Amino acid sequence: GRVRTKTVKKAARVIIEKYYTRLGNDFHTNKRVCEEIAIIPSKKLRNKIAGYVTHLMKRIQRGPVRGISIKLQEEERERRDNYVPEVSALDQEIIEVDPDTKEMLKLLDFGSLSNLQVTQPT
């Protein structure tokens, strides 16, 4: 049918990997800037590279890419990665604990903690 080969896919991959900024989801804007960078032969190779670039940046909007690796990841995933909640989930007001663990704490000279609540294994 119509399956893109090794050369066009690898070229589109390295075109995504570096020069990611100057291209875009619009098709023809990619076309010319491919000519502005890669000294490419025929226009059938060019118009086939510029097709997979648009088809790959449409795929970027669905999340990560398993084949490329640049440490930019839009500007939202960086914002999503350094999310900090207002209250720590670790400073819990009360914790349910096994008596064996409390025995370990007492043996550890840490027997005077106040946030602990000993529960029984019913």
């Binding site: 070229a11 570096k18 020069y19 960078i37 890669a38 000294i39 032969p41 190779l45």
Partner: protein, 65 residues
């Protein structure tokens, strides 16, 4: 490409036993013709120029020149 890169040259040599045929197919390289090699590259190779490392924006600077 097989028309202007490889240089096929068949020759016949005559020995005591008979005739031996010789084929020598030498593929020309790139680096356009400073007396060596054809101009146009192989119609598949794409070479990508790395970008000039540009200055990232820090402060809006208006310099009159």
């Amino acid at each position: 490409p097989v028309n202007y890169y490889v240089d096929t040259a068949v020759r016949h040599v005559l020995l005591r036993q008979g005739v031996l045929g010789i084929k020598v197919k030498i593929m020309l390289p790139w680096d356009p013709t400073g007396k060596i090699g054809p101009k146009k590259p192989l119609p598949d190779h794409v070479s990508i120029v790395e970008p000039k490392d540009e200055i990232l924006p820090t402060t809006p600077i208006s310099e009159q020149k």
